[PDB]
Ligand SMILES: Nc1ncnc2c1ncn2[C@@H]1O[C@H](COP(=O)(O)OP(=O)(O)OP(=O)(O)O)[C@@H](O)[C@H]1O
């Protein structure tokens with residue numbers, strides 16, 4: 001089941017891709033707020 | 041009265057999506073920088 | 078601050094005397110001497126008799142006087158469950174904290 | 185720094201003699217003669233008998249005896265689990281390291297010891313049980329397959345205990361699996377004297393025992 | 398390409414399988430004839446190959462050894478081994494993927510190269526963990542059915558694949574899915590039975606050869622003797638016996654009470670003697686299963702003594718009956734009755750008569766096994782025994798202590814009726830064609846049986862007497878030889894006056910009880926006993 005194990009790991013890799021995307025979104029939102037506050 | 045029984049169980053997985061939140065945030069990001077500059 | 082007057086059990090002098098002599102006596106004498114003697118401690122008690130003699134009361138009272146953790150209670154056939162192999166996991170659970178502290182603190 | 189006098193087991197001279205003659209004899213002789221003989225070692229020991237005679241004391245002290253890795257122990261049925269194909273995962277997990285070290289080092293590998301306790305809980309005659317969704321069945325066939333195998337191991341030792349020796353599956357007891365079956369019984373007078381002597385040495389050491397005993 | 402299918406460096410000897418050889422010859426003839434022959438003839442003939450082999454039999458024989466050897470014999474892609482139910486997995490639809498993963502490579506190779514590829518071997522071990530009946534395996538989940546259907550669809554589906562060999566072994570064949578047990582799938586099936594004498598000799602030689610080569614085996618060892626003694630041993634037991642004997646020899650040079658030591662001198666001098674073999678036969682190893690293992694030592698604890706004429710007469714009659722039943726056509730069934738006064742040795746003579754006969758199938762039916770059985774169980778037990786006896790060509794059975802087999806007691810009378818009707822019909826019916834049956838009955842109370850009207854069903858009766866003359870008493874004493882000549886004369890002087898009536902089973906008891914007293918009172922005590930209890934015609 002080694003190959004099936006790696007298939008599961010690929011699924012978890014897709015899950016971590018979603019997580020990474022959410023993280024960089026969170027960072028983008030923070031940068032939004034910082035710049036918007038700065039302009040004033 | 042007949043005896044009483046017990047079970048085995050089996051599980052399955054779900055997928056989820058990835059890309060919409062960043063298509064949105066990316067279309068959002070790259071103009072406020074221009075405005076501030 | 079324990080005192081036998083506080084127990085509230087009557088007519089059970091001899092039984093409680095024997096239980097105390099057998100079970101807790103080896104925990105109150107000074108540890109140094111028990112070290113030289115090398116005897117392991119008793120780990121069980123069984124109470125049986127006709128209805129309405131005062132078993133549960135005695136058990137509860139013994140539970141209070143011991144300056145230890147709150148006892149775990151099993152209310153008869155609580156532990157049973159319908160998935161294969163989950164019935165015993167409830168048994169394995171109860172002793173886990175005693176095993177853990179045995180490994181960390183020993184004697 | 186080992187001898188029979190320290191383990192503190194008494195009344196079982198003959199049993200321990202037999203176990204030693206049939207189990208560890210082949211592994212102590214200088215190997216060259218054994219290579220000429222070309223014999224493969226025994227990989228099974230079964231201890232049974234009535235309650236309270238020292239089966240577990242023997243298995244523990246033997247485990248401490250061998251200059252080997254820490255034994256892997258199984259306190260009754262720790263293997264059963266809800267999901268389809270999980271018990272087998274566990275049982276295959278027990279042997280893994282012995283196979284890997286056999287593959288890497290061959291005859292130079294050390295000795296891995298596995299100690300089952302209450303073996304008759306999980307292994308019974310195939311078919312005596314009925315209607316239990318078969319989860320009790322595939323455990324036995326997995327174990328039978330894995331001990332003898334098509335692929336072979338030559339560096340493991342399985343010790344089993346039970347208080348009911350009859351219900352165990354017959355296929356699991358033929359020579360080459362669990363071979364050496366010993367019976368541990370109630371002692372005779374001499375053994376009783378030995379036991380009494382062992383359990384009072386500490387007290388006699390410090391003179392805590394009165395001269396009138 | 399001219400790929401061969403057999404390893405050139407191969408020999409049937411090195412395979413070391415022993416007594417199977419006819420089974421192995423059959424396997425080779427069926428499985429590989431199509432491939433050994435050169436191409437053009439088979440091309441003209443256009444015969445397909447067999448794909449599935451099923452091996453079965455009781456525990457501890459060749460089967461795994463044979464499969465490992467067959468895998469080694471070919472020169473092709475290395476086999477992929479499946480160790481029982483390691484296919485099952487916890488997600489939906491994960492088992493079928495695993496199964497198909499095995500055959501994927503063979504499918505691809507066949508598709509690519511066509512009909513000129515190599516061979517792939519898939520070995521299913523403990524196949525009964527998977528292919529149980531889809532109509533019987535528990536209804537709690539599908540996965541067992543869908544696994545069976547996947548295997549059936551893949552081994553011989555719509556696409557034709559004819560370059561794969563699948564080997565299966567099991568313990569309980571009858572459970573396997575019958576759609577898998579049909580030609581073109583698992584088709585040749587064979588029984589790996591218990592080894593005969595010659596096979597035992599072969600196995601022993603195979604396991605002893607290496608020790609012979611280096612002169613570690615002492616020359617006194619007689620392999621044929623060992624073969625003759627060892628009855629019903631399997632191959633595994635035959636190996637374990639040798640291992641135990643070697644261990645008994647090797648232990649002789651080790652000390653292990655104090656810290657272990659080994660003598661580097663006597664380590665050079667090791668040999669195995671036949672005494673070690675003898676010792677291992679009784680203490681360590683015991684053969685399970687097997688047929689016989691009779692404890693005649695419990696039925697005939699004291700052999701026989703020919704205390705007079707009648708013992709010889711009886712034994713001669715029994716021999717005559719055996720000889721007659723051996724070679725006859727008109728009368729394939731013969732029944733003999735033995736009876737006489739109690740305590741007369743009725744059982745010992747019957748068992749010895751049976752043992753002197755050398756029929757393959759010899760069994761004794763006795764009530765001592767049946768304690769507390771109801772009126773039903775006894776019928777079942779008897780029916781089973783006689784069913785077994787009817788299989789073998791030649792069979793002789795002994796039913797002893799009839800009166801206790803009926804629960805007879807005189808106060809009523811009371812007895813079981815079902816048992817008696819079964820016994821009458823089973824005595825009457827003839828055995829299956831060409832077999833022959835002998836039945837020997839034993840009882841103490843002839844007249845009762847006469848009353849119940851079953852005496853006629855027996856063919857002939859034999860009378861077993863007890864001691865009648867003082868001379869015979871003296872001779873029996875001499876043959877026992879427990880008394881001195883002076884005591885013999887002392888006894889004679891009085892015993893000669895009157896005849897005696899006493900059965901030998903009681904004689905032994907009296908002698909033993911007499912020995913317990915002091916020397917000066919033995920004779921007298923003995924006499925008193927013989928006087929008091931011997932009062933009878
Ligand atoms: N010796 C006693 N002294 C004082 N009260 C008592 C005594 N024995 C019984 N009681 C009273 O009886 C009540 C019930 O007794 P308890 O719960 O011990 O029952 P039991 O006899 O052990 O029976 P059960 O088998 O039903 O549990 C106690 O709460 C207490 O009120």
Ligand SMILES: Nc1ncnc2c1ncn2[C@@H]1O[C@H](COP(=O)(O)OP(=O)(O)OP(=O)(O)O)[C@@H](O)[C@H]1O
Nearest residue numbers: 192193194195234235236237238239240241347379
């Ligand atoms: N031969 C012996 N020598 C020394 N101590 C002994 C002996 N037999 C019993 N004991 C004492 O009694 C205890 C018996 O425990 P043990 O685990 O050996 O029993 P057991 O028969 O295997 O138990 P179970 O039947 O519950 O599985 C030992 O730990 C030791 O305390």
Ligand SMILES: Nc1ncnc2c1ncn2[C@@H]1O[C@H](COP(=O)(O)OP(=O)(O)OP(=O)(O)O)[C@@H](O)[C@H]1O
Nearest residue numbers: 413414415416456457458459460461462600632633
């Ligand atoms: N006919 C035989 N000739 C020689 N050795 C034999 C023979 N039969 C068995 N043996 C030996 O005894 C052992 C048999 O092991 P093997 O795995 O073949 O038994 P098995 O009954 O096929 O296995 P299982 O118990 O899984 O059915 C091996 O050591 C083998 O060499």
Ligand SMILES: Nc1ncnc2c1ncn2[C@@H]1O[C@H](COP(=O)(O)OP(=O)(O)OP(=O)(O)O)[C@@H](O)[C@H]1O
Nearest residue numbers: 697698699701702739740741742743744745746902
């Ligand atoms: N010549 C002999 N014939 C038979 N048995 C003999 C003889 N000499 C000594 N014996 C011993 O005497 C024993 C007599 O007891 P046994 O049970 O065989 O007799 P029996 O007549 O069948 O018994 P029962 O009266 O109980 O039916 C025989 O088992 C055998 O051990």
